[PDB]
Design a protein around this nucleic acid. Structure first.
Lengths: 222, 53, 167, 51, 185, 148
RNA sequence: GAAAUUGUUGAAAGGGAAGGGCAUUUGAUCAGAC
RNA sequence: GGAAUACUGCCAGCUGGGACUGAGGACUGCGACGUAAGUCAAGGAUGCUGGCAUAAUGGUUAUAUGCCGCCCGUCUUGAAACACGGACCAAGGAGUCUAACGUCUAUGCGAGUGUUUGGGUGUAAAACCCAUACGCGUAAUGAAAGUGAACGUAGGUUGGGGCCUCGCAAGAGGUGCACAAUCGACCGAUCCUGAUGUCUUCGGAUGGAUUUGAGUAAGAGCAUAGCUGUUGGGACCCGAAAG
RNA sequence: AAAUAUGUAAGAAGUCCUUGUUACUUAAUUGAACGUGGACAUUUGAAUGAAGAGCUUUUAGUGGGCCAUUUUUGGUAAGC
């Protein structure tokens, strides 16, 4: 039983094939991410050239950051904040946009800032601040096998695959998002952009729906 | 709902299509094309003040 | 007994350190440092003097000369972050410089017993200066006032700002 | 024992993404799109320029 | 700060490392904490937890329940193991031959099974015979038979055994306990 | 022992575990059993129903020897028989040899039919017996012999 | 042979209190290590 | 008609300057570059060099400077308070013991339990041994006179840890202690019913009931010790006007 | 006749099929309740979260409260 090159050559072969499989799906998502990103661009030209208006699909995903501290919050908003796992200032969570989630977002509007996040924002978050809930323990991802052993049931094998299930809300988004620990962000690097935070974004403040300006805000936090 | 829920599974097992017996909430809308044939936009402006009394 | 005992004793053996993963790579000098450049020293005996940069020594230091005939600065080595690289260039080609290295500058470390209370030059370091300077002073004569420029001391005047000056 | 970060430390990036090597070598971040010459309808321009 | 959804620094509320200073019980626990760690068998998890338990959570199993246990379908050959104490029941005049594993047997019980052809064993001898608890069954004595539980929860209209030193007539069997004398309970 | 009580841990702390507002006082609610039909009613009613009033009839000059009648149940009936002297009777259901169990010599005034004697015949000498007790002994084959 | 309180010598500071905390300059003193 | 620039966004685009940190201590893991060897910025700092080797760094203390700092304890919604006690210091100074008890715990023996009222004995107020008794538990329910705890594998249904069989596994079937819910059976009481019969007024068979018990349904108890709580006690300490 | 609040449900203890019991009920094996046997298992029956869940014993202190936005009563008002 030499057992220093027999199984080691076996484990390396099993590692190479996993790296091999991870490679096509990253390439596969690339043409899938490119094609769709160019379809809406091109479908807008066709509408204008045909004398019509292309009404894009309503956004399916929002990123929510808790803006207020933990003091002096009425019962109903405090419960809804807990159900989204935002239990301290500058915390992040992805929420699937649905009727049962919109009404939660209205109750918490004075306390959160949210919008529609792009690929660059979400890709950077998981790479820098992505943690998995591993047996009720907050574990840095830092390897594909960590996601593999915990989200391999649903076909998720990598950190890049996990981002895919987030941005395109798939059949296993609920488990995938739940696996992702709530993001602990810092304060924005360049500031909040306003003198007073706790007014609505429409009213010169910070809280509410900032439809794409969340990307600028989260990147300064990230 | 049980009757339809029991009925849909019974018909589905003849072909196995994963009938998805669960209920879904109201989803965000998907894309569409709105055309302006005879529906050309008309511009509205804020109205001035009047007392009406 | 005044203090009874500890029930257990830490092991006296030392642990080997883990495998360090910090390799040594060559230093990258800034672009303003080209051999033959005139340097403005910032610290030491010869702070404020102007000297000629000859060679990059292997221990990250710059081989430098006054020349000794011009301003009295011999063949030394200095650190790149204690000099200012000027735009003035003196052609260093034609100077035999490959013999100088770290082993050339050996201090013959002194023991603790030899404590000097109140109070020479090594034999052939007076001819190496002459050999190099002879090929270097000839190149100095080409540019007018250059020999005068090297013989002066740099200083900041009233109202000059290093963040705006050029050298 | 220590969290090293992707988006830097290129070695860590290749560990988590085998596609990073070909993403960079192909310059997919600065890719160019083929030009198209379609133009908006006359009704669109008048509406945009309407009072 | 954090908005805690649960109380912080809450201990498990379960008992580990039983608080008795008996040296021999500690050795039994040590043998079974190793066993539960390294055998991946749910039987050694139970025994290790049961070795922790207190006296009122170890009611005395009698030889009659053991006899009834062995009269279950296909259980007359299983090894009986009691984490606790085994007492004698002079209310049965027959007995099977099955061996018993326990902490303490009474002399009457030790006499009983030995007379009936059995052999009473300790818990370690069980380990070297049933490391995964093969062919065993756990018997737990009646916890709610103690005289203190009768008194637990008493109030109006539940009949729950008042604490009383001397009983009989003219001891809290009066107004409050009948409709003839005031209200009843 | 004194070194373990919480009095050692209440040194340095003003109220000594009695409160600052409550201000532990001598007998704030009355001494002994005060307030039974008054401010302590809810406690007495919930825990001591029957504490006030009377229920029956009196009995002067009671001595608890006329009602002395310790009970032996029919479950055992056999701890009185000696241990090594038992098994030869249980295995031999022999007539005209059956044991006599004098419950009084044991100290029992009554026998009641708790249950399930072995079917060997035995003679029992009892001051009193229960109804179902007497035939269960007799249905086994024995007989009960009243004694005084 | 303690403390409160007191005398003498020595040192230091002091424009309507004094005492305290963080940080360091200065003065006095000092352990470790070699 | 052809470009540019702005603005917004993206690059797993390149690159310069500054600051803080170096936890870990043989290898293992994941990777990257290489035909291979091997190398690396890859599961946490190393290499070269200088001065000093001493109060130089550092500790202590006193002072100075910048900023800050209201008097403690107590009652209280609220104290720095123009609310109360405290001029200063030493020594003493306030939740204890007992009889009876509740929960929890630990120990022994266990249908029992408890030597220590007393007796024997003794190295003598100890240690050791012992019968008859005695209290508590094993039987309760009725004011009482009284009666007195199995239709049945000591019941059925449901949930159940553990165990057993099949199964690679997932899972399936069997047995199912403690415990939970529930319905039935048994004992006592109240209201019925009233059998064979007999001192013709006794006795109480059997079948019942929106009645009821601090019950049975293969015993858990007894002892000693401990924290905490209770009652009586001077009852944490100090405190009347009185009789 | 709102808004904000408030009760119930969103399954396996469910649904469907056949038939055994009875001293109740019906003209009527008609029903009512409880069961026997069979079929439907991981999208098993909306969302999100779950930090473990359910349970018991015992015992402390407290039982003078006060303030702010909104609602509101007495009062001219009030640090009422």
């Amino acid at each position: 039983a030499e057992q220093v090159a027999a199984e080691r050559a076996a484990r390396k072969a099993a590692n190479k094939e996993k790296r091999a499989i991870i490679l096509e799906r990253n390439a596969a998502y690339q043409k899938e991410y490119e094609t769709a990103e160019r379809n809406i661009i091109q479908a807008k030209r066709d509408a204008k050239a045909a004398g019509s208006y292309y009404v894009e699909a309503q956004h399916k995903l929002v990123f929510v950051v808790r803006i207020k501290g933990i003091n002096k919050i009425p019962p109903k908003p405090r419960k809804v904040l807990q159900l989204l796992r935002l239990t301290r200032i500058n915390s992040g969570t992805f929420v699937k946009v649905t009727k049962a989630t919109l009404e939660l977002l209205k109750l918490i509007e004075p306390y959160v800032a949210y919008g529609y996040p792009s690929y660059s924002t979400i890709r950077q978050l998981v790479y820098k601040r992505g943690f998995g809930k591993i047996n009720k323990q907050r574990v840095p991802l830092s390897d594909n096998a960590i996601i593999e052993a915990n989200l391999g049931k649903y076909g998720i094998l990598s950190i890049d695959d996990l981002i895919h299930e987030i941005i395109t809300v798939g059949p296993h988004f609920k488990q995938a998002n739940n696996f992702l620990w709530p993001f602990k962000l810092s304060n924005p690097s360049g500031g909040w952009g306003v003198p007073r935070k706790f007014k609505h974004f429409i009213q010169g403040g910070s809280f509410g729906n900032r439809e794409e300006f969340i990307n600028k805000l989260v990147k300064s936090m990230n | 709902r049980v009757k339809a829920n029991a009925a849909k599974r019974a018909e589905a097992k003849a072909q196995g299509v994963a009938v998805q017996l669960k209920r879904q909430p109201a989803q965000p809308r998907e894309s569409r094309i709105v055309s302006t044939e005879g529906n050309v936009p008309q511009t509205l402006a804020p109205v001035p003040y009047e007392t009406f009394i | 007994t005044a203090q009874q005992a500890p029930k257990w004793y830490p092991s006296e053996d030392v642990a080997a350190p883990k495998k360090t993963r910090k390799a040594v790579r060559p230093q990258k000098l800034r672009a303003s440092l080209v051999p033959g450049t005139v340097l403005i020293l910032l610290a030491g005996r010869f702070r404020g003097k102007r000297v000629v940069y000859l060679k990059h020594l292997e221990d990250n230091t710059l081989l430098v000369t006054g020349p000794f005939k011009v301003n009295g600065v011999p063949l030394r080595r200095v650190n790149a972050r204690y000099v200012i690289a000027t735009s003035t260039k003196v052609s260093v080609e034609g100077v035999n410089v490959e013999k100088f290295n770290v082993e050339y500058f050996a201090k013959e470390k002194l023991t603790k017993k030899e404590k000097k209370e109140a109070n020479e030059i090594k034999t052939e370091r007076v001819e190496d200066q002459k050999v190099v300077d002879k090929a270097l002073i000839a190149e100095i004569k080409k540019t007018p006032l250059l020999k005068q420029y090297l013989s002066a001391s740099f200083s900041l005047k009233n109202g000059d700002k290093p963040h705006m000056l050029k050298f | 024992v220590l969290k090293k970060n992707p988006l830097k430390n290129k070695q860590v990036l290749l560990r988590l993404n085998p596609y990073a090597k070909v993403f960079a070598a192909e310059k997919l971040g600065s890719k160019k799109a083929e030009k198209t010459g379609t133009k908006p309808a006359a009704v669109f321009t008048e509406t945009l320029k309407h009072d | 700060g954090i908005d805690h959804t649960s109380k912080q620094h809450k201990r498990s509320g379960h008992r580990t490392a039983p608080k008795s200073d008996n040296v021999y019980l500690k050795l039994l626990v040590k043998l079974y904490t190793f066993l539960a760690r390294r055998t991946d068998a749910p039987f050694n998890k139970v025994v290790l937890k049961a070795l922790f338990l207190s006296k009122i959570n170890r009611p005395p199993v009698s030889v009659s329940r053991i006899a009834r246990a062995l009269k279950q379908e296909g259980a007359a050959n299983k090894t009986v193991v009691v984490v606790g104490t085994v007492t004698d029941d002079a209310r049965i005049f027959e007995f099977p031959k099955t061996t018993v594993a326990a902490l303490r047997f009474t002399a009457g019980a030790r006499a009983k099974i030995v007379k009936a052809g059995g052999e009473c064993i300790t818990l370690d001898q069980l380990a070297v015979r049933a490391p995964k608890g093969q062919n065993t069954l756990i018997l737990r004595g009646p916890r709610n038979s103690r005289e203190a539980v009768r008194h637990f929860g008493m109030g109006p209209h539940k009949g729950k055994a008042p604490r009383i030193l001397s009983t009989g007539r003219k001891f809290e069997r009066a107004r409050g306990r009948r409709r003839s004398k005031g209200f009843k309970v | 022992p004194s070194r373990f009580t919480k009095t050692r841990k209440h040194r340095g702390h003003v109220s000594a575990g009695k409160g600052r507002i409550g201000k532990h006082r001598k007998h704030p609610g009355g001494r002994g059993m005060a307030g039974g039909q008054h401010h302590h009613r809810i406690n007495m009613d919930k825990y001591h129903p029957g504490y006030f009033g009377k229920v029956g009839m009196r009995y002067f000059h009671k001595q608890q020897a006329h009602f002395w009648k310790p009970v032996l149940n029919l479950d055992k009936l056999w701890t009185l028989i000696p241990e090594d002297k038992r098994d030869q009777y249980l295995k031999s259901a022999s007539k005209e040899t059956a044991p006599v169990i004098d419950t009084l010599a044991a100290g029992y005034g009554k026998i009641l039919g708790k249950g399930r004697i072995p079917n060997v015949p035995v003679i029992v000498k009892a001051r009193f017996v229960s109804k179902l007790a007497e035939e269960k002994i007799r249905a086994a084959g024995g007989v009960v012999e009243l004694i005084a």
